[PDB]
Design a protein around this motif. Structure first.
Motif, PDB file in Angstrom:
ATOM      1  N   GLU A  11       0.834  -1.201   0.000  1.00  0.00           N
ATOM      2  CA  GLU A  11       0.000   0.000   0.000  1.00  0.00           C
ATOM      3  C   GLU A  11       0.864   1.244   0.000  1.00  0.00           C
ATOM      4  O   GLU A  11       0.676   2.143  -0.819  1.00  0.00           O
ATOM      5  CB  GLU A  11      -0.927   0.031   1.222  1.00  0.00           C
ATOM      6  N   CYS A  12       1.815   1.265   0.920  1.00  0.00           N
ATOM      7  CA  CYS A  12       2.739   2.375   1.063  1.00  0.00           C
ATOM      8  C   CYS A  12       3.435   2.694  -0.262  1.00  0.00           C
ATOM      9  O   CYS A  12       3.544   3.858  -0.651  1.00  0.00           O
ATOM     10  CB  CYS A  12       3.755   2.044   2.147  1.00  0.00           C
ATOM     11  N   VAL A  29      -1.841  -4.287   3.766  1.00  0.00           N
ATOM     12  CA  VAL A  29      -2.916  -4.083   4.723  1.00  0.00           C
ATOM     13  C   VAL A  29      -4.015  -5.107   4.477  1.00  0.00           C
ATOM     14  O   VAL A  29      -4.233  -5.521   3.342  1.00  0.00           O
ATOM     15  CB  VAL A  29      -3.498  -2.652   4.618  1.00  0.00           C
ATOM     16  N   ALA A  30      -4.681  -5.538   5.532  1.00  0.00           N
ATOM     17  CA  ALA A  30      -5.804  -6.450   5.395  1.00  0.00           C
ATOM     18  C   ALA A  30      -7.015  -5.906   6.139  1.00  0.00           C
ATOM     19  O   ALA A  30      -6.871  -5.279   7.192  1.00  0.00           O
ATOM     20  CB  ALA A  30      -5.431  -7.833   5.896  1.00  0.00           C
ATOM     21  N   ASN A  31      -8.202  -6.147   5.593  1.00  0.00           N
ATOM     22  CA  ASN A  31      -9.428  -5.575   6.144  1.00  0.00           C
ATOM     23  C   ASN A  31     -10.141  -6.553   7.073  1.00  0.00           C
ATOM     24  O   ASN A  31      -9.798  -7.735   7.120  1.00  0.00           O
ATOM     25  CB  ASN A  31     -10.375  -5.108   5.019  1.00  0.00           C
ATOM     26  N   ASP A  32     -11.136  -6.039   7.796  1.00  0.00           N
ATOM     27  CA  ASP A  32     -11.943  -6.819   8.747  1.00  0.00           C
ATOM     28  C   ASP A  32     -12.419  -8.159   8.173  1.00  0.00           C
ATOM     29  O   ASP A  32     -12.515  -9.149   8.897  1.00  0.00           O
ATOM     30  CB  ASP A  32     -13.149  -5.986   9.193  1.00  0.00           C
ATOM     31  N   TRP A  36      -6.986  -9.447   2.109  1.00  0.00           N
ATOM     32  CA  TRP A  36      -5.975  -8.442   1.811  1.00  0.00           C
ATOM     33  C   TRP A  36      -6.606  -7.205   1.183  1.00  0.00           C
ATOM     34  O   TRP A  36      -7.567  -7.307   0.414  1.00  0.00           O
ATOM     35  CB  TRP A  36      -4.935  -9.005   0.846  1.00  0.00           C
ATOM     36  N   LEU A  37      -6.052  -6.051   1.506  1.00  0.00           N
ATOM     37  CA  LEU A  37      -6.500  -4.790   0.946  1.00  0.00           C
ATOM     38  C   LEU A  37      -5.463  -4.306  -0.062  1.00  0.00           C
ATOM     39  O   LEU A  37      -4.263  -4.488   0.144  1.00  0.00           O
ATOM     40  CB  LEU A  37      -6.684  -3.766   2.067  1.00  0.00           C
ATOM     41  N   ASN A  38      -5.915  -3.693  -1.146  1.00  0.00           N
ATOM     42  CA  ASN A  38      -5.018  -3.349  -2.246  1.00  0.00           C
ATOM     43  C   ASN A  38      -5.262  -1.928  -2.723  1.00  0.00           C
ATOM     44  O   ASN A  38      -6.292  -1.336  -2.414  1.00  0.00           O
ATOM     45  CB  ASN A  38      -5.237  -4.312  -3.412  1.00  0.00           C
ATOM     46  N   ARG A  39      -4.326  -1.402  -3.507  1.00  0.00           N
ATOM     47  CA  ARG A  39      -4.449  -0.057  -4.061  1.00  0.00           C
ATOM     48  C   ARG A  39      -5.569  -0.045  -5.094  1.00  0.00           C
ATOM     49  O   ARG A  39      -6.256   0.957  -5.279  1.00  0.00           O
ATOM     50  CB  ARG A  39      -3.150   0.411  -4.740  1.00  0.00           C
ATOM     51  N   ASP A  40      -5.734  -1.181  -5.766  1.00  0.00           N
ATOM     52  CA  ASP A  40      -6.789  -1.352  -6.762  1.00  0.00           C
ATOM     53  C   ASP A  40      -8.151  -1.334  -6.083  1.00  0.00           C
ATOM     54  O   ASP A  40      -9.168  -1.003  -6.698  1.00  0.00           O
ATOM     55  CB  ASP A  40      -6.612  -2.678  -7.509  1.00  0.00           C
ATOM     56  N   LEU A  41      -8.153  -1.689  -4.806  1.00  0.00           N
ATOM     57  CA  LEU A  41      -9.371  -1.724  -4.015  1.00  0.00           C
ATOM     58  C   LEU A  41      -9.571  -0.374  -3.334  1.00  0.00           C
ATOM     59  O   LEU A  41     -10.625   0.252  -3.450  1.00  0.00           O
ATOM     60  CB  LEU A  41      -9.286  -2.841  -2.968  1.00  0.00           C
ATOM     61  N   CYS A  42      -8.536   0.071  -2.637  1.00  0.00           N
ATOM     62  CA  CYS A  42      -8.551   1.371  -1.981  1.00  0.00           C
ATOM     63  C   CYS A  42      -7.276   2.154  -2.309  1.00  0.00           C
ATOM     64  O   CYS A  42      -6.220   1.922  -1.719  1.00  0.00           O
ATOM     65  CB  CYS A  42      -8.702   1.201  -0.468  1.00  0.00           C
ATOM     66  N   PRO A  43      -7.367   3.092  -3.268  1.00  0.00           N
ATOM     67  CA  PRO A  43      -6.215   3.868  -3.750  1.00  0.00           C
ATOM     68  C   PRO A  43      -5.664   4.837  -2.705  1.00  0.00           C
ATOM     69  O   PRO A  43      -4.533   5.304  -2.819  1.00  0.00           O
ATOM     70  CB  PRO A  43      -6.772   4.649  -4.951  1.00  0.00           C
ATOM     71  N   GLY A 109      -9.309   4.513   6.433  1.00  0.00           N
ATOM     72  CA  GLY A 109     -10.654   4.908   6.811  1.00  0.00           C
ATOM     73  C   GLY A 109     -11.487   3.749   7.315  1.00  0.00           C
ATOM     74  O   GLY A 109     -12.341   3.919   8.187  1.00  0.00           O
ATOM     75  N   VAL A 110     -11.237   2.570   6.778  1.00  0.00           N
ATOM     76  CA  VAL A 110     -11.999   1.386   7.144  1.00  0.00           C
ATOM     77  C   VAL A 110     -11.218   0.538   8.142  1.00  0.00           C
ATOM     78  O   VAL A 110      -9.999   0.677   8.247  1.00  0.00           O
ATOM     79  CB  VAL A 110     -12.357   0.545   5.898  1.00  0.00           C
TER      80      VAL A 110
END
Length: 130
Positions: A11-12, A29-32, A36-43, A109-110
């Motif tokens: 992410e960084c 980063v990984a979400n609740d 996994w959380l990604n830039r494509d998911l959350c820029p 944010g999430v």
């Protein structure tokens, strides 16, 4: 000039320090949801300013303070091996701590937390929507 932008953290993103070339990993980063959380998911997460010190990963956010996490200078049993579920793949990821969770839960944010995948499992690939 060469790009010279090393990516220790996902992410960084890019780090213009040569020190990062020795501390890179499948950081992210990984979400609740356990995913996994990604830039494509959350820029938004792509907007992290990365700094590396001898032993500490010092993150800084445009809006959030600094976050210094131990790079890989832990060799004890307090290394939080978190059971994550990327799609349906159960994999061991290391938790960077509640401090990293809250820090990005503000910038991202999430409800998410920064996690460092351990090289024992190593590969996870992320769901190809398969």
């Amino acid at each position: 000039m060469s790009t010279t932008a090393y990516q220790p953290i996902a992410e960084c993103g890019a780090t213009t320090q040569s020190e990062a070339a020795a501390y890179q990993k499948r950081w992210l980063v990984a979400n609740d949801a356990g995913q996994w959380l990604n830039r494509d998911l959350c820029p938004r997460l792509a907007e992290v300013s990365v700094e590396l010190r001898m032993g500490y990963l010092v993150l800084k956010a445009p809006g959030m303070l600094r976050l210094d996490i131990p790079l890989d200078v832990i060799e004890d049993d307090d290394s939080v091996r978190y059971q994550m579920l990327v799609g349906e793949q159960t994999v061991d990821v290391v938790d960077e701590g509640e401090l990293a969770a809250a820090w990005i839960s503000n910038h991202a944010g999430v409800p998410c937390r920064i996690l460092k995948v351990h090289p024992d499992m190593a590969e996870v690939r992320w769901p190809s929507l398969e």
